[PDB]
Design a protein around this ligand. Structure first.
Ligand SMILES: Cc1nc2ccccc2c(-c2ccc3c(c2)CCCO3)c1[C@H](OC(C)(C)C)C(=O)O
Ligand SMILES: Cc1nc2ccccc2c(-c2ccc3c(c2)CCCO3)c1[C@H](OC(C)(C)C)C(=O)O
Lengths: 142, 142
């Protein structure tokens, strides 16, 4: 799968909104709890994501997520295109969030604990998602 | 320089607070505009950072940044130690922020544009910071 492809969705938990990005090739995730499910929050999240990784295309399971002018501006500026030509991790990450939830006060804190647990887990049968993304991208540079 | 070492500081711009993390070995940056210069914001930022990269030690130019129990809890949970045994990028990133500032409404938007510009720049004399971090970490896995 192309190293430049990401998937972005929002899930809902405890009346809050979790924006989840998945690097499709590796299974690596990054997430944030956002104060509203809005184009502006999506646009801002995409700018951060694009500054870190070489983001070429983004897919989502809710196409209307990407109609706002604010999202279109962020994909224009960062040189991102929509991927139409294509988990849920939102289940497995939700599973981890449930497992750690009582260990933190704020949902956002549990989310980041779950991201960390997910990305560091050896998928032995055996590198972790965090190891795979770095390998996939580094290899693609060369 | 060790691949696990990061530097974290806050700068101030327009009465807001910018938390800046630098991966010392590569020059890669990540940043966020935070609503207050507080231990809780620092702790939360460290949890996100640690879920993405293999963070072993963190340095800062203001040691009192790391005294709060909330920061100590985040370094405990994520397995991070303080680096005492050690730019400013906060100048060069501030320079880029100034260069793009009028192109965005919100300071936070300009910050992320400046992060993106910084990380993608070929340092030809020639890989970018974003390319170096991924190479440094991938190589260290192997
Ligand atoms: C509100 C809060 N108050 C505290 C008071 C004293 C000590 C720790 C905390 C923590 C905390 C910090 C790191 C951490 C975990 C919890 C749980 C394990 C991972 O590391 C939080 C957390 O909130 C912030 C992260 C925003 C500070 C939380 O939601 O519980
Ligand atoms: C508030 C705001 N309103 C808009 C209305 C219409 C079109 C775009 C925007 C943008 C925007 C989006 C992406 C982007 C840039 C600006 C500037 C170039 C990089 O990409 C913003 C920005 O704010 C958010 C990012 C939170 C939406 C901003 O601060 O200007």
């Amino acid at each position: 799968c192309s190293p430049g492809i990401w998937q972005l969705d929002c899930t809902h938990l405890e009346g809050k909104v979790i924006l989840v990005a998945v690097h499709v090739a590796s299974g690596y995730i990054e997430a944030e709890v956002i104060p509203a499910e809005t184009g502006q929050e999506t646009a801002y999240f995409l700018l951060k994501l694009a500054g870190r990784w070489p983001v070429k295309t983004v897919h989502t399971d809710n196409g209307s997520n990407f109609t706002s002018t604010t999202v279109k501006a962020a994909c224009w500026w960062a040189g991102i295109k929509q991927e139409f030509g294509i988990e849920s991790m939102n289940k497995e990450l939700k599973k981890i969030i449930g497992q750690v939830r009582d260990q933190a006060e704020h949902l956002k804190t549990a989310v980041q604990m779950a991201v960390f647990i997910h990305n560091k887990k050896r998928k032995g049968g055996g590198y972790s998602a965090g190891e795979r993304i770095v390998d996939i991208i580094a290899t693609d540079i060369q």
